[PDB]
Structures are given as C-alpha cells and as structure tokens.
Design a protein around this ligand. Structure first.
Ligand SMILES: CC(C)CN(C[C@@H](O)[C@H](Cc1ccccc1)NC(=O)O[C@H]1CCOC1)S(=O)(=O)c1ccc(N)cc1
Lengths: 114, 114
C-alpha cells in the first residue's frame, strides 16, 4: 500500500495523502478516492505507454511553505499517489539520499518528516 | 534535446549519458542503443500500465566515488534515460528545488565531482 522513500504526507482537501516524491513526474497524481473530478483531461506519457486521464477539481494542499490550490491527475493505473515537479517547485523541497533511504527537507533546511 | 531538470550527465560504458534524475524510478533506465543485453528481464510498472523490459549486462558507470558496475533496464518506451533510486543511493545524492529549476549535488552539497 504505502510508497517507498522518498515519501511525504500532505493534507489534500482535508484528507491525508501519502505521496511518493517523484522528480520524474511532471504533474502530481492521485490514485484512489481522488474526490470530485473535472470535465477536463490530459494525455499522460508513462514509461510503458500513454493514456488519457482526468484532472480533479481544485484542492487545497497544505505545503510546509504555505497552503496553495492544486489540481491533480486521477491515474487509477498508477501504483500510488505521486508528488511531482509541479508541487516540488512550490515546496522548494530538498531530497537527501542517506543510508538505504531518503528524506525530504524544506527550503529552510527543516526536516519534513522522520 | 535534454531531459527536464533535475538532470545529470554520467559516463556509462565509457560515454556520457544525460539522465532525468528520477526519485520515482526504482531502477535506472537507458532507452536507446543500450549495448549487450542480459537474458534477464524485470516487470516495470509505469503510471499507465506495466510490461517487461530487458536488463543490460554490466556497465562501468563513473560516479563521484569513481567507478561502479551497474545494470540498467532498457526501456525504449521511455523518452529519456532515468537515474533512479538505485544510483541516487550509491551517489548519496541530494536534489534541490529551492534554487531556480532543480539541481543535483553530492552528499556534501558539491555539484557532482563525477
Ligand atoms: C510511475 C512511477 C511510480 C514510476 N515511473 C517513474 C516516473 O517518475 C515516470 C518517468 C517518466 C518520465 C517521462 C516519461 C515517461 C516516464 N514519470 C511519469 O510517468 O510521469 C507521469 C506521471 C504523472 O506525470 C506524468 S516509471 O517510469 O514508470 C518507472 C518504473 C520503474 C522503473 N524501474 C523505472 C521507471
């Protein structure tokens, strides 16, 4: 069920979501229970092929850097939710590989977990 | 055309490869003219579906610490090579978004002395 490290939990529309922190993902992804969906869609290129997916409606996302509004792709084919570059750029996150795992820290150097 | 940031160029098999640095990738990936392939394969579970891809035979990769022997998945459905968690752990790498764009550095903050 839970993603491998680097992972981070964020309050997304008043619910916790544990994301795989995914620097290779252009946009962020919800997989199950995405909440209300919008009418609009996008083509998603994955490693093994491409498919059309729907955008969620807007969600409040409680980033350590301050709350923002964000829409996610609803990708039920995807193994777990993905925190991609669209939100990492807002969070201004640092990702540190150390030991056999990885930890996320904020733009002030504050740990975002552990 | 380079991959988006965060990206890094490493010598593989003696020649430079520019990777998208990808914390969402369990294993590192090459995509074009990969050289000799093993008889072995892995199931790759992508955002949009899954299927199997071949492992390469061993490659010399020049990291910061010097040479490592590493096997890559050959995934021609991927638009660019991916440097995954396997090698990010070996490199003890840090990824920073707080700068403009995204940058990748070593265990002590040096853009990789690779
Ligand atoms: C889906 C995650 C869980 C795993 N993938 C890594 C991801 O970062 C993946 C990398 C990628 C970039 C550009 C085009 C195609 C693929 N980006 C991705 O699909 O972007 C989508 C999701 C939303 O935004 C768009 S993987 O490529 O399937 C993968 C799986 C196993 C190995 N060993 C290596 C790679």
């Amino acid at each position: 069920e839970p993603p491998p490290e680097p992972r981070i939990t964020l309050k997304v529309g008043g619910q916790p979501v544990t994301f795989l922190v995914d620097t290779g993902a252009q946009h962020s992804v919800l997989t199950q229970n995405p909440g209300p969906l919008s009418d609009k869609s996008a083509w998603v290129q994955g490693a093994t092929g491409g498919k059309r997916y729907r955008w969620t409606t807007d969600r409040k996302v409680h980033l350590a850097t301050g709350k923002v509004t964000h829409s996610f792709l609803h990708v039920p084919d995807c193994p777990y939710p993905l925190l991609g570059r669209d939100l990492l750029t807002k969070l201004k996150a640092q990702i540190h590989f150390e030991g056999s795992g990885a930890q996320v820290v904020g733009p002030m150097g504050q740990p975002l977990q552990v």
